[PDB]
Write a protein that binds this ligand. Structure first.
Ligand SMILES: Cc1cc2nc3c(=O)[nH]c(=O)nc-3n(C[C@H](O)[C@H](O)[C@H](O)COP(=O)(O)OP(=O)(O)OC[C@H]3O[C@@H](n4cnc5c(N)ncnc54)[C@H](O)[C@@H]3O)c2cc1C
Ligand SMILES: Cc1cc2nc3c(=O)[nH]c(=O)nc-3n(C[C@H](O)[C@H](O)[C@H](O)COP(=O)(O)OP(=O)(O)OC[C@H]3O[C@@H](n4cnc5c(N)ncnc54)[C@H](O)[C@@H]3O)c2cc1C
Ligand SMILES: Cc1cc2nc3c(=O)[nH]c(=O)nc-3n(C[C@H](O)[C@H](O)[C@H](O)COP(=O)(O)OP(=O)(O)OC[C@H]3O[C@@H](n4cnc5c(N)ncnc54)[C@H](O)[C@@H]3O)c2cc1C
Ligand SMILES: Cc1cc2nc3c(=O)[nH]c(=O)nc-3n(C[C@H](O)[C@H](O)[C@H](O)COP(=O)(O)OP(=O)(O)OC[C@H]3O[C@@H](n4cnc5c(N)ncnc54)[C@H](O)[C@@H]3O)c2cc1C
Ligand SMILES: O=C(O)c1cncc(O)c1
Ligand SMILES: O=C(O)c1cncc(O)c1
Ligand SMILES: O=C(O)c1cncc(O)c1
Ligand SMILES: O=C(O)c1cncc(O)c1
Lengths: 370, 370, 370, 370
């Protein structure tokens, strides 16, 4: 009578699914392809929606400890402050990726989720069979494809899809705060520092805690200096001289990567006993900082629909119908914002922009009205 | 088998108790002495702790709609900004008293709490008897004394106590925002505007929403002009000229009162089947903006302890033991702050100051670390 | 024994020459080609050097009354303040062109300078003969060619020269201050408001007094909207929205012109009894705001050299040798600044930039050290 | 035929008189009581009027080199900026006392003024006799009493007078700028930093040049800590913490003095061939920073009246009649400002306040209109 779930992928989506299912009495095993449990991307923003998932997962405490809510989300254009936004009290948080990942892994382990590394799902069958690269075939009542933009759970089954990999991208790093060295200013703020002149270069400045600063350095791929790794210190200091202390530390990082944006959209997220969650289903532009938020809401919501006494197949259909439109709208709006460079104007966290963030997955209503 | 509760007082404490008990299946009747259900005091701050009570009461949505979280809590001394505090993301909110009261009344009514007006508790018996001014004697399994600083539930039984009524006080009003007329500034902020020179006059500036502004005008009773009602417009405009548009509206209010501060502390909060909650038990100085927050946490916590399968008498003892120290510490610290004028320095919402605010009554842990 | 001077041109150079010579006992007649005595160009800056000429001319009082020294000379790039300069106390002043012109005309009249309008010099002879368009031939001991960039005194004689008329230019206007309507800011400042993005548009904001504001609206000739007269209100408000009240008034002016920059440089400024002064000799780019300053210093200096007991011919040679290098350097540096857009960086009023301004023609030394 | 002048006192008044007379062909001897030529008081402000005297004395160049005009004269009350004043371009300057004194001494020496030290005037006779402490009796056509508030030239003759020495005063010091250590701010400004709460303490912050800062630390004599010398570092840092780097240097100065304010007013300034100039005649409160300015204007004006071909006795009478009302008005207004603490309000350099500053002694008119 113990339902069995097999989860492919140990990112935020897979860990969320695994914890949520285990809390509801599922026998859960999670399979991570990589040799270690790790999260790439340097830093990450969560909002009310994702923080509520964490509360629902019993992992909120560990996350809030050692992460940061800036006093304001500030936008600059050509070094002129154009907006300061606080979202009418809507909760939000910045943290390192490792911080969020560790909290989730620790919670999954505390609950007794069986986690395997070097364990890649290479095929999934809608009847409830997952095949690993080792040739092991696992039977389950539920298969969760949380295996990222390149999901083999998805592609082994075949889902009609549009995927896009941009030519442009950015360099994401964690460096020391160097707060004193930054001198006068509001250095606890998020500051999105846009420029189009004299060149297209932007830094998203994102404090994670008293020690760690998350920087995103964005320049076009066609710019050989701005897109260089390790960073071309001179061209960054030239346009962001007020960040020189931090940029000097950034230039030391030989692990720096220029990572490209990538999106996925599918005609459906389910097939029989298989559900696709996270980037496997709905990778999106990061303008609204909701890729993981939506992934986590969707994973948590999946566990909710599986508590209705329905067949797994029916629960999965109900789940997508219920929760997908929030994600579709957020993905579309984030892509629109990215293409139009809407964030450069400031004051763009409108009620519509904040729809996903306002959703409370625990009570299934929208909170924090704007 | 339906447990019966009789609640004396229709303030925030009594309404919270009534809703929380009704949600847990108690047959609840609430008795308000006044001819109408009303809340005095103009405006009010709630923090995470109180907002979590509201969530637990199913009244959070109605409260957040039409209330305000300032971008920052700012302090001025002699018109110089000395601090801006955002509490590392700790949720907080400002609203009119009527806004909070209405949300609670509407929720109690929706749940079918029996509410009587012109119904004053004049005596309570620890065996579970409440006598109204009408001579009606009501039997119950639980009596809640939520009847304010002058609690007759408390005083009919006899509780060792120290009460204090200050000679000093303040004038609290709601006026239009007049935001455009205030011109350049950060007029969505809370701004605590202190002065000792040329006279002791202070205004706590507290936006409630896009339409309503809560002002507290504080001057010593020995100052015949600053303590006058309706307000002596000239002496307020002289020291707060930047608020003239709002003060002109304030001066129109012939309902204005100079209300005195009042505190209560008791050796215990329980006797048999009687529990004292709110100002009946623990009225405190308003420096930490936690009088109602603690009252609401205590009322909600009472309902929790009554779900343990214990006798009512034992549950009440357990309740006070569990929850009272948070209130004792907050009351003491708020009184210390008031006497030392500590808030005038700015940056005084320390981790210790925020202890009560950080408490989450739903999960019974402290959240939002500083 | 009364030396006779004939001056061609009633601009700042010619009026300065006429007053200075008349003060020294010359019989002076001045000939203005136009039907009225008028000054075009809306507004003008003078510095210490030009203010000292005015003192020497007995016209300083009338100029300082009704003109303005801003508290600072401020530069913006893309709406971000990049510098505020006060030149270590070096005197400077902004005024309407008419204000300066009127003061000079009134002083010349008070001294009994004979002024003719509709009186154009069409030929000059180094032996001391000036021919007017009327055919009148005037004999004099000194002929002053103060007849502008298109000087016929110069060109009738033949001076080796390089002249340049730019394709680009600007629209100069006087509008009401609208100070209250501009709201919060430092609206008594000079503010040089540069932009390259989203288009090349710049406004030099120059208060003249409590009533009048001098604006220079600069856009490339290749921009059909930004270079349009009367002004294309929308494209100016878009990039300078904080000046909308003033720009609305500017758009009413059907007299607005897009005037082109023009320079002149000559191998010499003298021939026999003929001296060329002002734009006739040394028109320059306006970056250092010294075209008229140098013109006035040169005209005044001419009068000084004529007091040495030398022949007029020798005095003129001595004059150019003594005073020309200040002008040559200023012209070259202003042209360099214009071409490199150096002023866009702010903090460019260096000691070298301010050399002409620092010169005191009365004492013949440099003052106001930097 | 060479007129002989004997000047008592080598302060700013006596040096000005000596230079001005020597320039006009007087045989001038100056007698300084002290063993060295020195100026006490740390720093000093001059305005247009005094700068024009310096121009008239041929000492302006040496003064402007190595002195400072702040970008603005700023006033703070309780650390809040209440005004920024630039006087519509009216020239002004801050310098060390030694800087001004040296320039004057060097000019007097260059002109061949005979200067004696350890040479005290102890008696003067209206017939033109000056007696030194050595017993030497000097005959002259003019005797100038420029010997300070305690003038023996004045008191040996007997002038009806009111003198006042205040109980209160201030500590004036020169310290290093420590500009970098002061961090963010407008540290080239004059800043008059007033406080009445928590104690009456004020600092006038006055940069003299890139190296030297003039500070005036003002507290009541009844305050044993604030009036202490060497300075009580703690009580100054407490109320001016932003000046700590400079105050630490100030506390090292064991030469610091708490000097009292002193005023003098006389029924007349002349007797026969004797003229009283400077503090000997008109010491005043320093609120308008015009004590030396008026002293210098008066000394220079004296030389002017002596060029009219009148008897010395008549010239002196004409001089006082012509020039004294400017000083009487300035003295009265400065005393009014001091007593009413008017400067604490900011924006008090009104046209009337600036009357003395606006006077141009060279042309004998008022300039720099407000
Ligand atoms: C630049 C940038 C900035 C962003 N910023 C934010 C932000 O601020 N806030 C936010 O909420 N989101 C943000 N996002 C989006 C966020 O990174 C993703 O949406 C999120 O990490 C998706 O998580 P996931 O678990 O679906 O996928 P992934 O994080 O890709 O994790 C899947 C895990 O899949 C494992 N794996 C892959 N294939 C297999 C397999 N076949 N079998 C087993 N394991 C497999 C992968 O190795 C890995 O361990 C940002 C994205 C980008 C690109
Ligand atoms: C100036 C000031 C500012 C404050 N600001 C804040 C703030 O910002 N945030 C915050 O959390 N707290 C604040 N407080 C404290 C807050 O006002 C109180 O702690 C709170 O209202 C107490 O609620 P209560 O229900 O216990 O009592 P009450 O609000 O006094 O309500 C009891 C209700 O008792 C009814 N009643 C009385 N006697 C009887 C009886 N015998 N029988 C039946 N009914 C009876 C009373 O009429 C009334 O309807 C502030 C207090 C003051 C004085
Ligand atoms: C955009 C711009 C901004 C500027 N801003 C400043 C500034 O802020 N400060 C500054 O000092 N300078 C400034 N200048 C330069 C300043 O305008 C000139 O250098 C100055 O006006 C030259 O004066 P002028 O007397 O030599 O010539 P003009 O002003 O040209 O005057 C000559 C006079 O010549 C009369 N005339 C012409 N031909 C004859 C003839 N044949 N016979 C008789 N009369 C004749 C002309 O009609 C006229 O009345 C600026 C210039 C430009 C273009
Ligand atoms: C706190 C303070 C701040 C001030 N700030 C300013 C300011 O910013 N700007 C400004 O313009 N003014 C200022 N003043 C006023 C200024 O200090 C005086 O007005 C000025 O120094 C007066 O100069 P004096 O030459 O008349 O007298 P003094 O400076 O007193 O000089 C007279 C000289 O007299 C010599 N002496 C005295 N007796 C004899 C004698 N019997 N025989 C020979 N020699 C004699 C004295 O030793 C000395 O060398 C300030 C004054 C004070 C108190
Ligand atoms: O626009 C972005 O690339 C972006 C990336 N991360 C967070 C965010 O709010 C925006
Ligand atoms: O100090 C107060 O009186 C006070 C009153 N209300 C809220 C608060 O934070 C402080
Ligand atoms: O750069 C200019 O065009 C310019 C024009 N007028 C004054 C000035 O300082 C600069
Ligand atoms: O008020 C003063 O003591 C004062 C002292 N020096 C200059 C000044 O402007 C004011």
């Amino acid at each position: 009578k113990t339902r069995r779930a097999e989860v492919a992928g140990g990112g935020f989506a897979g860990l969320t699914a695994a914890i949520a299912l285990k809390q509801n009495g599922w026998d859960v095993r999670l399979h991570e392809k990589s040799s270690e449990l790790r999260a790439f991307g340097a830093g990450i923003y969560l909002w009310h929606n994702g923080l509520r998932v964490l509360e629902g997962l019993g992992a909120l405490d560990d996350v809030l400890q050692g992460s940061h809510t800036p006093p304001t989300y500030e936008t600059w254009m050509h070094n002129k402050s154009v907006s300061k936004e606080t979202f009418n009290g809507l909760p939000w948080r910045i943290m390192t990726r490792s911080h969020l990942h560790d909290a989730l892994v620790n919670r999954a382990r505390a609950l007794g989720v069986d986690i395997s590394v070097n364990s890649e799902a290479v095929a999934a069958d809608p009847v409830g069979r997952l095949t690993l690269q080792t040739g092991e075939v696992l039977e389950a009542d539920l298969i969760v494809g949380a295996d990222g933009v390149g999901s083999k759970v998805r592609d082994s089954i075949g889902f009609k899809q549009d995927r896009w990999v941009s030519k442009d991208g950015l360099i994401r790093l964690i460096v020391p705060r160097m707060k004193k060295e930054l001198g006068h200013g509001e250095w606890d703020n998020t500051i999105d520092m846009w420029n189009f002149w004299p060149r297209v270069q932007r830094i998203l400045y994102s404090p994670c805690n008293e020690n760690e600063l998350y920087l995103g350095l964005m320049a076009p791929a066609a710019d050989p200096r701005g897109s260089s790794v390790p960073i071309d210190l001179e061209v960054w200091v030239e346009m962001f001289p007020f960040l020189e202390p931090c940029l000097i530390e950034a230039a030391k990082l030989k692990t720096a990567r220029y990572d490209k944006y990538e999106t996925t959209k599918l005609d459906s997220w389910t097939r029989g006993k298989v559900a696709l969650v996270g980037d496997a289903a709905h990778a999106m532009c990061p303008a609204l900082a909701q890729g993981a938020g939506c992934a986590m809401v969707n994973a948590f919501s999946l566990s909710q629909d599986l508590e209705e006494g329905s067949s797994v197949e029916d629960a999965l259909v109900a789940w997508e119908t219920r929760i997908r439109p929030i994600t579709d709208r957020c993905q579309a709006l984030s892509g629109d914002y990215a293409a139009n460079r809407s964030l450069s104007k400031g004051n763009m966290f409108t009620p519509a922009a904040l729809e996903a963030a306002r959703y409370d997955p625990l009570r299934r209503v929208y909170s924090w009205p704007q």
